[PDB]
């Protein structure tokens, strides 16, 4: 009847491994994995590379996810990967006592299942060049931990591959990947992106922490209120509003006493406006602190502390390393920055893109005149040009144009002291010296036609003395996205938040 | 008049008054400004000049011609002292200054005969010059005074009630203890975000707003998306695992959660600050069990040394007095059924072999079984293993061989739970099984369910209250003494 064979053959791909000291491959339980009824040193590739870029000596254990399998005759090549490290392990039979069922078994097994795999390593001739690390791995045994139970959304290959003006080259878009984000998070650059994500937190909290700054948590269910842009909620049949933004908290927070603050922490944007640079939630890294007379010391204090990011991102072998990753899908100049950065005042901006032909306004409506995103970019090319940088300042906005707290000039009060930050000419940062005297703000309240019944806790924080302080607010995913030049807030996000999507 | 026109004197050059309110421009000859926490930190050589220094008026008192300040700054105050000169008119200034307000003093610092007990800069100032940049406008709700003293619960004594302090944080958060507390605040954040990263952990930040809830629907704050039906989130837990399965290997989260628990209570809030593990393991989910012990104890090593942390304990304990907390060397490990019958041999519940691991511990007798330990173990700091699989989430793993068991564990301090976690289910088929087995959805969680079923790494985690863990760890009577501004049912503002 002929189905016998194939009910064998079956059993041979199912094939579950009861006892890893008699056997050489099948599906095993994690209980199982005993070698002499000890327990098996095992490693990943990680530590495989930072060691040969002892387990040369003999046979070693190592786990890792089948990025790829080739399937030659008697020799079949396996990719491990973990990370953004891969090598190529390789299970010739002719070396394994002809056990044609375990190379029916490891052929037969789907990509991106998780193997351990005891071998021996050694140099080859000629390294494959795909794998960072260029030692490989001769199988001796392989068991399966976790098999993949269900097709691939779409293949790694073709997820990892650069932008395809090529013949036969497929692209997978944007809402595919972000469908499927727990398939697209495993490219190489994906993998690297939210790597140095982890690293300008890093860097931000450290730096601070270091100036004897502390870091704080402010509420973000909040009973009042830009109350546009505000998301609803029912907070026990009272009516609350999801935070915007920190500010009112780490202002109130100044007047407190505690003199220099930070904050990391998500904020809620109901943006009803789908571009690729915001995003209706996003992590925002906020400064608030004081200044002795003059605001402008807070202000070369927050460029300081991005000339020092910068620096360090671009420093050192492992953020080397990432930066190169993502860079190989998606290829962008590196970031430059001076030992100077530039300052211009609003006034200056505008009268640099009239004079390159990029603006026309009518010698009257320039004070009232708001600069656009688009012409932001024309200023950040303009400044490449002849400064040689993606970062520079913009300060001294008009009030007219900047939020109720900013504190204005005593004797120009059409001007205020409020700055922006760029990289590639886009903005990065927001901030203001505060207005820190109560009559001052409650005029300043009024005359944006603002309730100051809703704001009096705020208001009030303010009535039993207050420093001088200044702060501003960065997107986190922003200042990642405009340091790589990637061309979509969505790929520095890691499950992100628009209009049309609340899923994953 | 003419005696209102000196003590709302404004000067219009310092140069040469010596006195009055001006404004942060008029102050220009730019002076070398100190503050107290520079003068503590330098003393305890600029004693050899007129300094400048700026500081709020901590507490003010004219005996005679001689005018006494009290400056604070932070944690850190001194005393400052006017004797005219000869210049009544600004004795006369200084003396109505509101408590609060915020000058710089110009003098000279010089040892003194009897160090003040209050201050801890054991110093003082003698006053050259005084101005006022910021002038308290309104009258305190309460007293600095009374807000700082440890309370005695007599009849006519002070107490400020919580409620006030909470509706005026802002004053309330100047007492000593207030300003520390939040200082260890940061400091746990530090020490335990450092341990990690020097752990080759790295940070994540995952969304707050769903279309399901994270850990129980009946618990979740609804919003509106958009005209979709949304949910703030309760924990990472589902997008922190699908990290794991993403290949990220190690990933912590600092983070707010929203939980709409409609009880008033002294240990709980509707919004706190999660810190989150997920990791994976090699054969074993214990490895990550006794890596998050160990993360603990180092915590508790770096608040008790010596240096900042026993500065700030010790001005926490002044107002809010506690015995030092205390952990072992090594940690007491007690499985569930073993709490249960350490509880029951103390008489403090009766139940038959076949009831244990039905019984759902309560808050009250976790504080029991606190006090047992304490006084037999010598320790606040203990974990519980393998907890009831029926009483834990649906992403728990259960014991192969003995399923009505989970892989599953708490950590408490001074008897209460601060961190729970558990091996997860890295099966997806197991997946749905339980999902099923505890009568929810899949088709809500189908995101989450299909980050399992191109492979899953063996992975744990926990969660942990970073405001339960300062306040157990002060050994706090309320979970609202170490939130900023805590969020209740009945409380939404500040
Ligand atoms: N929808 C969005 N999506 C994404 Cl992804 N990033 C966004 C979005 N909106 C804004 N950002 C980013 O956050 C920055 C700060 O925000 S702000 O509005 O300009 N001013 C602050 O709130 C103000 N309180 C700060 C202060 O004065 O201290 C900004 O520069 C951008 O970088
Ligand atoms: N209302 C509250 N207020 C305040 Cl102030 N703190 C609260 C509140 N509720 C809880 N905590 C604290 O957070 C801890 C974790 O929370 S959890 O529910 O037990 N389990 C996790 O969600 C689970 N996904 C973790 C995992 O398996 O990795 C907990 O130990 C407490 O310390």
Same mark, same amino acid.
């Given at each position: ?19 890893? $000291?008699?056997?050489? !491959? ?9 070698? $002499? ?89 000629? #390294? ?100 546009? $842009? ?62 002795? !007379? ?96 993606? !970062? ?106 628009? #209009? ?5």
């Amino acid at each position: 009847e002929r189905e016998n064979l194939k009910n064998e053959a079956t059993k041979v791909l199912e094939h579950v491994c009861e006892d890893i $000291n008699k056997e050489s !491959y099948g599906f095993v339980k994690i209980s199982k994995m005993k070698e $002499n009824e000890k327990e098996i040193r095992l490693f990943n590739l990680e530590e495989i590379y930072h060691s040969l870029m002892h387990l040369l000596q003999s046979d070693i254990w190592v786990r890792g996810r089948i990025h790829d399998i080739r399937s030659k005759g008697s020799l079949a090549f396996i990719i491990l990967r973990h990370k953004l490290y891969s090598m190529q392990c390789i299970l010739d039979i002719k070396h394994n006592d002809n056990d044609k069922n375990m190379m029916k078994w490891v052929s037969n097994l789907p990509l991106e299942s998780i193997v351990d795999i005891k071998g021996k390593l050694s140099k080859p001739e000629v #390294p494959i060049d795909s794998t960072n690390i260029k030692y490989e791995a001769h199988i001796r045994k392989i068991f399966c931990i976790s098999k993949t139970a269900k097709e691939l959304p779409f293949l790694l290959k073709d997820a990892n591959m650069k932008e395809t003006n090529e013949e036969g080259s497929i692209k997978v878009n944007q809402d595919n990947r972000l469908n499927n984000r727990c398939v697209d998070l495993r490219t190489y650059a994906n993998y690297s992106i939210f790597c140095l994500q982890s690293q300008i937190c890093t860097i931000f909290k450290n730096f601070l922490l270091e100036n004897n700054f502390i870091e704080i948590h402010t509420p973000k269910l909040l009973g009042e209120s830009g109350g546009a $842009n505000a998301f609803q909620i029912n907070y026990f049949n009272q009516k609350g509003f999801l935070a915007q933004s920190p500010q009112l908290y780490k202002q109130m927070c100044i007047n407190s006493g505690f003199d220099r603050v930070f904050e990391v922490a998500p904020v809620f944007r109901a943006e009803n406006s789908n571009t690729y640079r915001h995003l209706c939630e996003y992590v925002s890294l906020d400064v608030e602190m004081t200044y002795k !007379y003059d605001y402008l010391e807070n202000v070369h204090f927050y460029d300081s502390m991005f000339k020092h990011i910068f620096t360090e991102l671009s420093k050192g072998g492992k953020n080397e390393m990432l930066i190169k990753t993502v860079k190989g899908q998606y290829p962008c100049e590196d970031f430059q920055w001076l030992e100077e950065t530039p300052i211009f005042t609003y006034e200056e901006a505008i009268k640099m893109l009239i004079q390159h032909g990029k603006l026309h306004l009518k010698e009257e409506e320039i004070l009232a005149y708001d600069m656009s995103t688009d012409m932001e970019k024309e200023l950040g090319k303009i400044v490449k040009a002849s400064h040689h940088t993606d !970062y520079y300042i913009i300060i001294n906005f008009p009030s007219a144009l900047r939020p109720f707290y900013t504190m204005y000039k005593e004797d120009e009060p059409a001007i205020s002291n409020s700055y922006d930050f760029f990289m590639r000419g886009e903005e990065i940062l927001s901030g203001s010296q505060r207005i820190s005297d109560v009559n001052l703000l409650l005029e300043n309240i009024k005359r944006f036609n603002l309730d100051a019944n809703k704001l009096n806790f705020y208001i009030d924080s303010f009535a039993y003395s207050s420093y001088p302080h200044s702060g501003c607010g960065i997107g986190l995913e922003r200042v990642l996205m405009l340091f790589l030049g990637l061309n979509n807030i969505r790929k520095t996000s890691l499950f992100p938040r628009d #209009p049309k999507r609340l899923i994953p």
